[PDB]
Amino acid sequence: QTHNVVHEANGVKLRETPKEFFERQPNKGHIHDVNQYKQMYEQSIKDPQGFFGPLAKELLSWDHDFHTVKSGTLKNGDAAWFLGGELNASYNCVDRHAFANPDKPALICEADDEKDSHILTYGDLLREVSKVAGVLQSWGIKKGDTVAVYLPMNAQAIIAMLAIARLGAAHSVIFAGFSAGSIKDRVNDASCKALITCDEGKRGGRTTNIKKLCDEALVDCPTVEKVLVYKRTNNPEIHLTEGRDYYWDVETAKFPGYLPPVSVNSEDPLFLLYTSGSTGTPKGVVHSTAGYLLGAALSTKYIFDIHPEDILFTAGDVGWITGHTYALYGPLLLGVPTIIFEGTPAYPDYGRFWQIVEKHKATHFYVAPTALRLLRKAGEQEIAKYDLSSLRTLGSVGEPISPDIWEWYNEFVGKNQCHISDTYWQTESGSHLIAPLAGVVPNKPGSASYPFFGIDAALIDPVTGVEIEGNDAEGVLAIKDHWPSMARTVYKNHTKYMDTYMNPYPGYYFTGDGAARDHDGYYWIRGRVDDVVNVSGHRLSTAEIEAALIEDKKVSEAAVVGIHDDITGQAVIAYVALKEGEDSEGLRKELVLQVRKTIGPFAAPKSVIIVQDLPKTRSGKIMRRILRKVSSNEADLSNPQSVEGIISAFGAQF
Amino acid sequence: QTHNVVHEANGVKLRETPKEFFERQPNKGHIHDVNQYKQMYEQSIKDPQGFFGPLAKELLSWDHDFHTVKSGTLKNGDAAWFLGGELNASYNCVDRHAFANPDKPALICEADDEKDSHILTYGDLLREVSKVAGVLQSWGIKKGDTVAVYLPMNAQAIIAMLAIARLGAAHSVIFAGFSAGSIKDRVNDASCKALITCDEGKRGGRTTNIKKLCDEALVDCPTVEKVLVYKRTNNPEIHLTEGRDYYWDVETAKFPGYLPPVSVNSEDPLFLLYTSGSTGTPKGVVHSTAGYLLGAALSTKYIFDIHPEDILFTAGDVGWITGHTYALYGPLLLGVPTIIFEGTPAYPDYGRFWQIVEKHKATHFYVAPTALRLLRKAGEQEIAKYDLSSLRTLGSVGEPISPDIWEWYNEFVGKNQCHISDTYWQTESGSHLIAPLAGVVPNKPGSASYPFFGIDAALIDPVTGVEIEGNDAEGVLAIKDHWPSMARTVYKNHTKYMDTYMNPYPGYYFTGDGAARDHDGYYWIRGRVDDVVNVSGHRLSTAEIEAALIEDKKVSEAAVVGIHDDITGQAVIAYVALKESEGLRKELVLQVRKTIGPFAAPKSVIIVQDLPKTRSGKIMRRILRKVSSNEADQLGDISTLSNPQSVEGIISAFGAQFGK
Amino acid sequence: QTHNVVHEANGVKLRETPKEFFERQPNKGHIHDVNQYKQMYEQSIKDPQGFFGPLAKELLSWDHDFHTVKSGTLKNGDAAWFLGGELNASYNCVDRHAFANPDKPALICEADDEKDSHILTYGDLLREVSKVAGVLQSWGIKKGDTVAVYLPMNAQAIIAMLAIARLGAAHSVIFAGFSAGSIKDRVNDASCKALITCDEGKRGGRTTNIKKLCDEALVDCPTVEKVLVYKRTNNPEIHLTEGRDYYWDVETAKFPGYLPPVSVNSEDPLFLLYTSGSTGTPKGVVHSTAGYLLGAALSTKYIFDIHPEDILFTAGDVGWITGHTYALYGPLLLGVPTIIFEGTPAYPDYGRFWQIVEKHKATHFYVAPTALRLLRKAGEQEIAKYDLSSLRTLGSVGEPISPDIWEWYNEFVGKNQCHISDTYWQTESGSHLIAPLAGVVPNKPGSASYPFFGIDAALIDPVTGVEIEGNDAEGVLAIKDHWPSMARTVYKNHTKYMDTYMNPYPGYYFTGDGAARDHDGYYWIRGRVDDVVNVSGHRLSTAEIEAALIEDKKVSEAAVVGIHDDITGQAVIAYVALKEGSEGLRKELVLQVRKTIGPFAAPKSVIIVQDLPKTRSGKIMRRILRKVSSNEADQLGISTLSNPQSVEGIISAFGAQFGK
Numbered sequence A: 001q002t003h004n005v006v007h008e009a010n011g012v013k014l015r016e017t018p019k020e021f022f023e024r025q026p027n028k029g030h031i032h033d034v035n036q037y038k039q040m041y042e043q044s045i046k047d048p049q050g051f052f053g054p055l056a057k058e059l060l061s062w063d064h065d066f067h068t069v070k071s072g073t074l075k076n077g078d079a080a081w082f083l084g085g086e087l088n089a090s091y092n093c094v095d096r097h098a099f100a101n102p103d104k105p106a107l108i109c110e111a112d113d114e115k116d117s118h119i120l121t122y123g124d125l126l127r128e129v130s131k132v133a134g135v136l137q138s139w140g141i142k143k144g145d146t147v148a149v150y151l152p153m154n155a156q157a158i159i160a161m162l163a164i165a166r167l168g169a170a171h172s173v174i175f176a177g178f179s180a181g182s183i184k185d186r187v188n189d190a191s192c193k194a195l196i197t198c199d200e201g202k203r204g205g206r207t208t209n210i211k212k213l214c215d216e217a218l219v220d221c222p223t224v225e226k227v228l229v230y231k232r233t234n235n236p237e238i239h240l241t242e243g244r245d246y247y248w249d250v251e252t253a254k255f256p257g258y259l260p261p262v263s264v265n266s267e268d269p270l271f272l273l274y275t276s277g278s279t280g281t282p283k284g285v286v287h288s289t290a291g292y293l294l295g296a297a298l299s300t301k302y303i304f305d306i307h308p309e310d311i312l313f314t315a316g317d318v319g320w321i322t323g324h325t326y327a328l329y330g331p332l333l334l335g336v337p338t339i340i341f342e343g344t345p346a347y348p349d350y351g352r353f354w355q356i357v358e359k360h361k362a363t364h365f366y367v368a369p370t371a372l373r374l375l376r377k378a379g380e381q382e383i384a385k386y387d388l389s390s391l392r393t394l395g396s397v398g399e400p401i402s403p404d405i406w407e408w409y410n411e412f413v414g415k416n417q418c419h420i421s422d423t424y425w426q427t428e429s430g431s432h433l434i435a436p437l438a439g440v441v442p443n444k445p446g447s448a449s450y451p452f453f454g455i456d457a458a459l460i461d462p463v464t465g466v467e468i469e470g471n472d473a474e475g476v477l478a479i480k481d482h483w484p485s486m487a488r489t490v491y492k493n494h495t496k497y498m499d500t501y502m503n504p505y506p507g508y509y510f511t512g513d514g515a516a517r518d519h520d521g522y523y524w525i526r527g528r529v530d531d532v533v534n535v536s537g538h539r540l541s542t543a544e545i546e547a548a549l550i551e552d553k554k555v556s557e558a559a560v561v562g563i564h565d566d567i568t569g570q571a572v573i574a575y576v577a578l579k580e581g582e583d584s585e586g587l588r589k590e591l592v593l594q595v596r597k598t599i600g601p602f603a604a605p606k607s608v609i610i611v612q613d614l615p616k617t618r619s620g621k622i623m624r625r626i627l628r629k630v631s632s633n634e635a636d637l638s639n640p641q642s643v644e645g646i647i648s649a650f651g652a653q654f
Numbered sequence B: 001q002t003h004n005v006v007h008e009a010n011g012v013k014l015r016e017t018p019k020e021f022f023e024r025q026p027n028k029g030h031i032h033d034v035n036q037y038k039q040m041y042e043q044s045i046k047d048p049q050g051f052f053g054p055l056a057k058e059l060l061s062w063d064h065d066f067h068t069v070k071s072g073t074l075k076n077g078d079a080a081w082f083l084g085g086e087l088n089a090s091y092n093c094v095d096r097h098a099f100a101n102p103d104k105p106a107l108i109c110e111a112d113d114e115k116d117s118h119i120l121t122y123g124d125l126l127r128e129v130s131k132v133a134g135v136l137q138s139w140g141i142k143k144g145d146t147v148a149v150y151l152p153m154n155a156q157a158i159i160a161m162l163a164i165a166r167l168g169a170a171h172s173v174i175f176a177g178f179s180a181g182s183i184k185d186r187v188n189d190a191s192c193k194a195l196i197t198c199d200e201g202k203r204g205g206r207t208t209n210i211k212k213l214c215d216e217a218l219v220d221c222p223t224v225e226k227v228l229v230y231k232r233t234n235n236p237e238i239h240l241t242e243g244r245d246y247y248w249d250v251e252t253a254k255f256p257g258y259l260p261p262v263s264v265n266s267e268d269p270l271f272l273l274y275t276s277g278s279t280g281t282p283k284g285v286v287h288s289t290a291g292y293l294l295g296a297a298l299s300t301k302y303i304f305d306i307h308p309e310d311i312l313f314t315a316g317d318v319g320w321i322t323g324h325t326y327a328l329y330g331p332l333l334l335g336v337p338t339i340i341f342e343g344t345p346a347y348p349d350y351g352r353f354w355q356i357v358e359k360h361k362a363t364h365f366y367v368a369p370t371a372l373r374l375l376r377k378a379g380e381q382e383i384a385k386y387d388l389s390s391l392r393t394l395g396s397v398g399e400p401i402s403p404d405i406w407e408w409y410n411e412f413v414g415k416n417q418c419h420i421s422d423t424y425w426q427t428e429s430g431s432h433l434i435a436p437l438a439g440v441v442p443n444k445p446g447s448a449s450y451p452f453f454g455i456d457a458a459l460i461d462p463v464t465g466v467e468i469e470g471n472d473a474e475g476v477l478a479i480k481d482h483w484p485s486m487a488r489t490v491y492k493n494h495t496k497y498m499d500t501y502m503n504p505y506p507g508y509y510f511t512g513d514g515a516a517r518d519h520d521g522y523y524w525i526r527g528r529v530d531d532v533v534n535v536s537g538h539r540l541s542t543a544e545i546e547a548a549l550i551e552d553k554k555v556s557e558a559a560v561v562g563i564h565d566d567i568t569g570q571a572v573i574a575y576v577a578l579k580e581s582e583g584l585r586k587e588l589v590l591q592v593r594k595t596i597g598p599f600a601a602p603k604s605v606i607i608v609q610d611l612p613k614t615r616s617g618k619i620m621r622r623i624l625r626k627v628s629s630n631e632a633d634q635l636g637d638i639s640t641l642s643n644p645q646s647v648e649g650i651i652s653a654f655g656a657q658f659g660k
Numbered sequence C: 001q002t003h004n005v006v007h008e009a010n011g012v013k014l015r016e017t018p019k020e021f022f023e024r025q026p027n028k029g030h031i032h033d034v035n036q037y038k039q040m041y042e043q044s045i046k047d048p049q050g051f052f053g054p055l056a057k058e059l060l061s062w063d064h065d066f067h068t069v070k071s072g073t074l075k076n077g078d079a080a081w082f083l084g085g086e087l088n089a090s091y092n093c094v095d096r097h098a099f100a101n102p103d104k105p106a107l108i109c110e111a112d113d114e115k116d117s118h119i120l121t122y123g124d125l126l127r128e129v130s131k132v133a134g135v136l137q138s139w140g141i142k143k144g145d146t147v148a149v150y151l152p153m154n155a156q157a158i159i160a161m162l163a164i165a166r167l168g169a170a171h172s173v174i175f176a177g178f179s180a181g182s183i184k185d186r187v188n189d190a191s192c193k194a195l196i197t198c199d200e201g202k203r204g205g206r207t208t209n210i211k212k213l214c215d216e217a218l219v220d221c222p223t224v225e226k227v228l229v230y231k232r233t234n235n236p237e238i239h240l241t242e243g244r245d246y247y248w249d250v251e252t253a254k255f256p257g258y259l260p261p262v263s264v265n266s267e268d269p270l271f272l273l274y275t276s277g278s279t280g281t282p283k284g285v286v287h288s289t290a291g292y293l294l295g296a297a298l299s300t301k302y303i304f305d306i307h308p309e310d311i312l313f314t315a316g317d318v319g320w321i322t323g324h325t326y327a328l329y330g331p332l333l334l335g336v337p338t339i340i341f342e343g344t345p346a347y348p349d350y351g352r353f354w355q356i357v358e359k360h361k362a363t364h365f366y367v368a369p370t371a372l373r374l375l376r377k378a379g380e381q382e383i384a385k386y387d388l389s390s391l392r393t394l395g396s397v398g399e400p401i402s403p404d405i406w407e408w409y410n411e412f413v414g415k416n417q418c419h420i421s422d423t424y425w426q427t428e429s430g431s432h433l434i435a436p437l438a439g440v441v442p443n444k445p446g447s448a449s450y451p452f453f454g455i456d457a458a459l460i461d462p463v464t465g466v467e468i469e470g471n472d473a474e475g476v477l478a479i480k481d482h483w484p485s486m487a488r489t490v491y492k493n494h495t496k497y498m499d500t501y502m503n504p505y506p507g508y509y510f511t512g513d514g515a516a517r518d519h520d521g522y523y524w525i526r527g528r529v530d531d532v533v534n535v536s537g538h539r540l541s542t543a544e545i546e547a548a549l550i551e552d553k554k555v556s557e558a559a560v561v562g563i564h565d566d567i568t569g570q571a572v573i574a575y576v577a578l579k580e581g582s583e584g585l586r587k588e589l590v591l592q593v594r595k596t597i598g599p600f601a602a603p604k605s606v607i608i609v610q611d612l613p614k615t616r617s618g619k620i621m622r623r624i625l626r627k628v629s630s631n632e633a634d635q636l637g638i639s640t641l642s643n644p645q646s647v648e649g650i651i652s653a654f655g656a657q658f659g660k
């Protein structure tokens, strides 16, 4: 009854699913109780063929039937699911629903200014997707090509992604907050033949330069042959390169409202999504089609308890896996409307999220703890102004959610009447790994609870490398076998894929996360064990930010570390040592701007600390732990004298 | 029994199908009576999924089954049929028949000179199509490409179209009567990668310059990488560009007699066919595969009453939709022989058609009224010299058929023993829209009778735009929902497609024709309500002929209108205003022959000082039509003219110059 | 009981299958006796659709079902099998077995040095093939492309062929014994986009220059865009051209262990294999996919009596059809392990073959008579040192096997306990044509016995061209209808295909071989009737060797003929007439052939003469040269001799120069 290792679980009462949840449920739940889930989970692990086989035939529409459910091993890096099958993601996300009820809402597009909001039905979505795919097809985009998308979180982003997939091409979405440097690396790694973007962006009421950043990147992108440009603001001063750039509205008007979808294999790549690891250069994560789609449909249906009558509002961005899986593919596969919100939770006020939920009577809400911390700070009064009684499932993602934020989230938003789903997963996992199923799994505030279907979670002693038997344990979180939506490779760098996920603990998948398992079997995520920082739910690499600082030729060496931040959860502090050859305060700001243009404004360090030399080991490498403690005011060795200078530089410049 | 609006229907007795028709039928008819047709028609309109679903699985062979029969709406321009299905037109037209009876005749090629006539069995056609597709495939022609065909109406034209479609590419046939300019425009719009043509042509005994006109156009066609040239006359003086042009016989000898067909989606384009509308620039009409093929097979089977034992002789050209649907796809889909005639109805004599029918015992004849009027003038005596007792279905297409031509066609050709099927349809419709089913629907000479399966015809008041309820009515002819073989878009210009067909009357498909519906429900086609003239059965735009005359820099403005002609049915008179006499008229007529082609030349060019223009500024063509039709005394209204003095000059110029 | 024509058959007792064979069979045989085979053969000939239809569904896994079993005729050259079907060769040879037993042995790779031997399971093979196919796909290699392979007989050669086929591309394997000249002709004829090779080879303990020969040819190969190089020896002195050449291990490491296979049509080309005929230029023989694969599985299963528990050791090379069909496709289709041997039967000793058989308990052995003659001469004592009791089927291929070698093979290798299968077939047949089924057909030493399923063998009188009725007859060996694995065309040269195989005797397939049929129906292969020489089982063209000698401009004319050799069966003698040009020059010409074709095609002896026996027209009397070389220069049979005095110079030159 007492835990010696998993201290989070001591004195934590199980929080049942409120009765109001089952009152608001439109139909019978998909799973009755935890016991039924236990048996379903056991079958998903002991008998994947008998479990996912029928579920694949049920939830997905196939152009060609598969003959083998599961193939390959984790250790050999040859995992494959539903081999021999053929299908198309846009048909499963659009066509099959449009043919049934073409007037059912599909994309609920809430623009930055609500005066620009609109709704696309599945019939509308089919025609728009078909037109964009018709444009791309006429440009030579064929199966096996990759098409980059640099768009904000609006309806055009969803249309672009589905139009690319309709042709059998893989879309590589680039988060609109990246700079020309990040756009350049991603476009050239995938050798994209085309790019879809817009003239300008509207977020928080402020206009962003989108097309100018594209033009800036495309001078080093010889593979991009044509660019489709959407008139978001219709600014007449935005220049289009003659012979390369063409207008969305102009080109789509030349093509009809239906284009046949292209059948692809189950294991044909659906999309690339470049993620940051302890790598220095972002690596292109590649996901299959059938495996990924099932994971999106399966998790969305069961973890969130999504029914045909439901409305899902994932407050995320398609530039990250959360927008991919649970704003686009998850809900559209199940045929339900999905709310696509372009702006911020603060514009025009801090009741923007709740006005949207009330406006469309959304039944499911999915956001990162960073927004909850902000809205607790500056938006508690706005929540009571709106009717949130349509909600019954509330989800958290991207970051650890403190028990206190869990309570605030449950009370002030859920009114002690909704189920909270702390969903743990990764870009590489495609869909949820560990999460409490809505209406099934009781909560422990701050825990993700039980693994999901097909995930045989395990803890590994980092020192010995041996799987830890028994509960009340801590260690590195690993998966003992591959699952349908697991990422299949790193684009054209499968050795890096193997070295990162399969080789560190042979026979297992290495998540890069630490976690603990208590006597009840619940998993408590501890955080990353590598050089990855979670700034406001956005995965960042300390190595990537350091390399950005090094691009400024005024820097000799740089060291970036992550510290606790009470709003962004975790913040990046950059320690920079300059070479030989004025205005120290002015130079700090130069380095911050250096990161904003190399990676992007969101990856800027909170503070840049200029030092004389960095604390370096006897060998010569940087001990970041000294920087971590000094930065977090916990400052209690080839150069043991520098440590005093580090503390003073931080005390003065911070 | 009396009509106040549909005057054509007054005092017109129903003309039943002669008993000899049912005697000559090889088997039981496909539909018994009008009662069964009414019930089938009702289902095709109220339950398209339950009607066309089974018919598609029956008449067409599928590589992949379809999951949805019908999708999209007319108003949104997203019509789709048999979604999810995969098939191949050449497999449906050739292979499946070659596998059953490889020695059954497929193409009965009657050449211009009968000494060059021959017959291709379905087995022969498979070998030739596979060889031509093997050549094209080796040249890089893959699915999604377009291949142009500039060939006369002979067996090589048919092989090229099927070979292009066998690879999943869309063929764009260019009528052999077009000029280097017309070839140039069509090739560049579709961005064709290859071209199939021949060295020279034989039509009416006269040699035509085929390859020479291609070379003339191809200097401005940068997308065409290779050209396959057939030795029709084997004239050694015909030049081939090294590295670009290759010979049919030389290259096809390099490849085997079977090539796998390429599966395409139901809604993948089968072909482009550039048609003339009231737009000025020819637009590439695009047809799907499964939808179009079914429409061709369904209409050919039911409207013409085609059985496996029958032989069809469509006296048309693959350069137009009539040759597309009812000389190639219609009959070949059903597995029956099709007579491909290369020459003219007058060479070597005016009994050429009837000698062909007698030679092969053709059971079905399909021609335009223009030929009937010509043969009435100079070939009536020849008809009796030949045994035409094998015929039982006689078809008319392209033009309105006058009651007198209907009687002449029934008596001297059909011997008052055949069914006459006046088939109304368009390039954009793919197959028949309104026609009397052979052996089922009684005729009214000059009427097309009832709509066909899946066609919910309607009349719209041009002024109000409201559907006209009830009979004894006239107005714009519209279709209330899309049908399987309806054209799906205009190539790379879907906005023009929408603006032309779907937007004028939202919720409907706008045919561009006026028509009347009588108390019996029969439709009487009145003619085009837009600037389209039917010159010798070939659809033409007055805007194209006007633009052709204006290219001659001696012309300031031009206005072309269509009037009745007793031989060609409708002729174009061109009114030209110069910027400053017989010789200049001859220059302008030749100007049209070089821009469009010899077939589109105006009947007469009338030089005038200035044209009748309205208050707004547009050319009042109705005055030009009336003056040309010798009705320049019942001019309904000239008070709308900014220059009512021009009318005096228009009448005098026409009276003086029309004879000269 | 006595033969007047087939003298080989006189006094030849039927040699029954030893009882130990049926003891060693893992299960009941696939066919019980000759009577059951006779009935099955009758159905394969009288009802191919009912015979091969079910067998195709049984032995092959289909992505799409076929609708027609058989199509086309021999005379029209449009043969096709299993039309409409779709499948993939690598899925049938690798994936479907890896999914069942991923750890079952697939490739038993015996390297030249046994220290480098290893075993790839079906799971291992899927990962290796998937990675190489992933590399090739990234280079743009898509369906319809051809990829050349210049590798020795090791596991990488098998992987390369399967990786190419996985993408829907056709692999064109180039035997590693060719020189840059032969590589050039094959690569440029197929327009290969890529090439898979290695840096150097290990054969007989000697290092071979592989990549150096590629670089020499590739300077004249503009179509090859990239080259994948395998580190066989890891020699750092082997140069790779930057931008074209890439390393096997480096590139495959970038891609995952599974890649989806690409479905192809039954009649989509699986591979090219350039064979030498009486033409002068090697012709690219093209084989279908489904038809070829079925032939490989069917013959391997039934003629060799292959069961799931068996191990096959085909002592051949993938550079020839024997390695294609019965070292790669045959066994892997059936899911059994196949031994891939890189070296020679003499390194490190002449018991190398038998050590391999004992090491892996191989149940089936398949080799050419040339190796048997070599091992009889210098390795007879080694055979008894090894346990060969696991064998039960012994196969002969490529050459006629003398009755004496048949006895030695049966006794010293089979211990008078195994079935001998003298398999007669060709590159163009894909799989066996005439062979004694293991455990079914009794043997006549030196005979191939009865035709196999679907092979309607026949004899044709060369003079009359008429099929020979009755037995005890001799003539040209022909097949009366096409069979599933029959070659479908010559790459981009179907006219040569027709002229070589279908046109000589219309209605039949002309094998190019003479044969005799005795009173029991057994076929006795007599040999090639054209200018083809069988040097050590490798088909060679005399015209190709003559053209190589003529490239040396020191030669005026050359004439190559084949003579009896007691080890290689047949050896090539070259008679060369110089212009103004002795021992050193003979070595120049021998090296000249080694430079154009390859060391294996080098003449055994080069005889310099003043002039060749030439006809009045200008032809070389080759029949005189054959007899003179075989010391039969008195039974010359000679009316066309324009220079009957040259014959004396030919005889003297041969008697003097053949030694030194």
Ligand SMILES: CC(C)OP(=O)(O)OC[C@H]1O[C@@H](n2cnc3c(N)ncnc32)[C@H](O)[C@@H]1O
Residues within 6 Å of the ligand: B275, B320, B321, B322, B396, B397, B398, B399, B400, B401, B422, B423, B424, B425, B426, B427, B428, B448, B511, B512, B513, B525, B527, B528, B534, B537, B538, B539
């Ligand atoms: C068939 C094909 C060659 O037509 P298009 O060249 O696409 O031109 C279509 C136009 O032709 C005219 N029309 C065709 N058929 C008939 C008919 N039976 N009775 C009366 N008018 C007919 C109509 O004006 C139609 O809109």
Ligand SMILES: CC(C)OP(=O)(O)OC[C@H]1O[C@@H](n2cnc3c(N)ncnc32)[C@H](O)[C@@H]1O
Residues within 6 Å of the ligand: C275, C320, C321, C322, C396, C397, C398, C399, C400, C401, C422, C423, C424, C425, C426, C427, C428, C448, C511, C512, C513, C525, C527, C528, C534, C537, C538, C539
């Ligand atoms: C199998 C492969 C290596 O053959 P190719 O290299 O294509 O040459 C084919 C020619 O080889 C000869 N032949 C093959 N098998 C035998 C045999 N069993 N008995 C006698 N002659 C045989 C024949 O002259 C055949 O036409």
Ligand SMILES: [Cl-]
Residues within 6 Å of the ligand: A053, A066, A067, A068, A069
């Ligand atoms: Cl299954």
Ligand SMILES: [Cl-]
Residues within 6 Å of the ligand: B053, B066, B067, B068, B069
């Ligand atoms: Cl259906």
Ligand SMILES: [Cl-]
Residues within 6 Å of the ligand: C053, C066, C067, C068, C069
């Ligand atoms: Cl069958």
